Each structure stands twice: as C-alpha cells, then as structure tokens.
C-alpha cells in the first residue's frame, strides 16, 4: 500500500520489502541472506538459535543442490516448525500459520481450512506442508528461487477482499512473531472464516480513538467488539448484532459486568 495508509496501519516495512531471489552462481552473502530471510519469514520472525539452524539443508542451498523452495520446504518440514507451530497449536491456528509463512497470506474461506484439515487427516503433516509449497499459488508467487514474503497487504490476482482485512489479524506487526507463551496460540479468524465475514482492522494507529475529557482518570480508551443478542429482560432495544463499545478504564470492569449480565459474548478488547 501507499505511504499514508501504511503509516496508519503500521505496514510500511512490508510494502518496502524486496523479494529476495537466489540467482545462479550467487555469492555466499546472497545465500546467507536467502537463508536468513527464509528463517525470518517461514519461522515467523522467531528468535532462532544456532542449535536448531538446520545445517544440512543450509549446506544443500550453499551447495545449490536444493532450490529456495526446497529450503523453505525443508524448514517447514523440520522439527523446529513442528515444535514452534504444529504440536502445541490447534488445526485452525496451524493452517493460518502455514498460510502466513509459506504463502504470505491469510486464508480466504472455510473450505480451504476444511481441505487442509482433510489433507492432514488423510496424509500427515508432511503431506499438509507440501500442499502449500506444491500449490499453484506458491509456484506463481515465489516459485523455485524467490524467498516467500507476505502478500496479504497487496492486491493479488486471485485474492478475496476479506484477505486484506484478515492479513492484519494474521500479521500483527513487523516486530511481532507467531510464538506465544507455552507455544500454544488460538486462531483469530475462526469466528469470521467459518461465517464468511470480516472484522474491522484496528491495527496500530488505526486502533486509536479520540479521548478528550471522556477518558476518565487514565487518559485511555478501551475498544470492545461484542456480539449482541436479544436480552431476556428486553429492557433496551438492541439495534445491531455486532456492537462497538468505547469505554474508559474506570468503567471497564462495570461494562464487562454489563455485557456478561446481558449474555453477550466479547470477541475483541483492545486499546483505543
């Protein structure tokens, strides 16, 4: 995207990112840069120690025996990827992680998730990982020699418009990763991917709201995406099923009590 949009959305560095291509007869610096870019993007900007750095497939690239795609496949098929993204994660989260790392994309629809879940159940993790690298989208986007990169913030030929809004729910920032505490993360897309809708983006400076004199003692606002239903008491007429609440710190516990007493479910709470 352009400068004014990406400055608000915090995706400036993704837009000024050049796809690294390992040309033939490349210098050791170029092979090292390709290996580092693969470890940053395929392993999701994790702090990768040298004890799990996969020296064999690194030498196979240095050797030019495998292509960049092979290296990406080798990295995604390794136990570093299994420990970081597969074993402690649920299937929805793991499929989203595969899309973000291997294809540089958010998933578009629920039948893609169903296809990848069915392929996992029919052929194992290795088969599932291969699905992404040996896809038409990977070959077209990166092919054999280009390091994969995030393409969800740009206009793609076969892409869904909801993919751009879901890319912010998948890509949290430049100085972020896909590791959580205990290495078990829940998916942020299961509410919308199953229902074929979108959420507001609210990424970085987009999430902010005007405070004024309404912010309370702490000059900060809290942003609540809540799915609202009809109250059993029917005291107040509910006008929309999905509702936005901007509430202060001094009323945040009270507002959570209000939403919980109304039976409404909280889907998102952020700063504003």
């Amino acid at each position: 995207t352009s400068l004014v949009s990406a400055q608000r959305l915090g995706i400036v560095a993704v837009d000024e990112a050049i796809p690294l291509e390992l040309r033939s007869r490349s210098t050791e610096e170029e092979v090292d840069a390709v290996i580092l870019a693969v470890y940053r993007q395929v392993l999701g900007n994790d702090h990768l120690m040298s004890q799990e750095r996969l020296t064999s497939a690194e030498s196979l690239l240095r050797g030019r025996e495998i292509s960049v795609r092979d290296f990406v496949r080798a990295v995604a098929l390794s136990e570093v990827y299994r420990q970081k993204f597969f074993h402690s994660n649920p299937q929805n989260r793991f499929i989203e992680l595969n899309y973000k790392h291997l294809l540089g994309r958010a998933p578009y629809d629920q039948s893609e998730i169903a296809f990848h879940t069915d392929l996992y159940h029919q052929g194992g993790y290795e088969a599932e990982i291969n699905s992404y690298i040996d896809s038409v989208e990977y070959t077209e986007n990166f092919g054999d020699w280009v390091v994969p990169y995030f393409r969800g913030f740009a206009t793609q030929r076969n892409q869904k418009t909801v993919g751009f809004s879901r890319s912010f729910q998948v890509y949290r920032g430049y100085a972020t990763s896909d590791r959580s505490q205990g290495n078990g993360s829940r998916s942020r897309l299961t509410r919308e991917l199953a229902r074929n809708t979108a959420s507001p983006v609210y990424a970085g400076s987009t999430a902010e709201s005007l405070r004024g004199t309404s912010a309370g003692s702490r000059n900060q606002m809290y942003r609540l995406q809540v799915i609202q239903g009809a109250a059993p008491g029917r005291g107040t007429r509910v006008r929309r099923g999905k509702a936005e609440y901007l509430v202060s710190y001094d009323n945040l516990s009270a507002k959570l009590q209000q939403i919980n007493r109304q039976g409404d479910t909280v889907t998102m709470i952020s700063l504003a």
Binding site: T1, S2, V4, S5, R8, L9, D109, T155, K160, T161, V162, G163, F164, S165, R166, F168, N196, T197, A198, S199, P200, V201, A203, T206
Partner: protein
Amino acid sequence: MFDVFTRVVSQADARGEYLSGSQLDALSATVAEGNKRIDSVNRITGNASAIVSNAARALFAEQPQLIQPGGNAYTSRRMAACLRDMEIILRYVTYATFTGDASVLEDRCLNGLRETYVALGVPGASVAAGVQKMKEAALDIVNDPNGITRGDCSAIVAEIAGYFDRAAAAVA
C-alpha cells in the same frame, strides 16, 4: 460460490427435497432471460474501460479533493489502485450478472471491502458515488437499442442495478 441454479440447489438440499415445479418454471424463465443476460454481460465487458474512465473522470470532477495533492486518489500508485478498484468492481458486477447470483460479488469482492477501505483511508462515499456513476453508464449501454434485436429487458437491467447498489452499499 453459486449461480442462479446452484443457489436454489443449495436451499433445496438444505431443506432436503426435490425442486418444485414453480422453481423449475422460474429457472426456465431465467434460461429464457439468459440470452439477454449474456448480451448485457457482453456490452458491459465491451465498454468496461470507457465506463471506468468516464466514471473516474466524473467522480474526480465533482469530488476534486480526491485528486488534490494529499487526496486519496493523488499519486500514480493511489490513482492506479483506484482505477483498478473501479475495474475490479465492474468485473465482479459482470461476474454476478453472468451467474445470475451475487455470491461471487458478495463473497469474493464485497466481503470486507468496507473494512478494507476504512483501514486504508479510502472514502467509501466517494467509491459509492463512482459505483453509482458506473451504474448509470452500464445501464445506459445495456438499454441502448442500437445494434441489437428489440425486446423487454427490464428484469436484467433491474438485476444489474441491484448488483450495482449492492456494490455501492458495501463500501459505505
């Protein structure tokens, strides 16, 4: 995604019985309207670039703040993306006209377009105005009786207009 046949197939399979005779007669009427539908798709496809260029010219004529330095349509990248957005919206309107169902238009183009345009800074009212201008351009080239055999075409024109206000209501 669905078309006019697979949509009725979808809720017939959801309620789990065969299609009624009224549904088959309605689909036969859709098949009868199909030649007019293909004519409408052909003419909007044939004048798509003229529609996009004229609608962009008019939209940035009565909204001069968008092309103005600092505006959303200012800079070659943002203007190229805006003309591309108009072309894609027209493309998915032709897709939904072709299928007879707005499943492709809602599911792959209009889903998340309001949230995308809020995130980017794209004014949805201006895009809705451009989509409206594309609606009168497409309905004037569809309802042009020159170079085509005459007939009643109010149903396909109403369907194209419904897809166009569907596109206009999904950005603002």
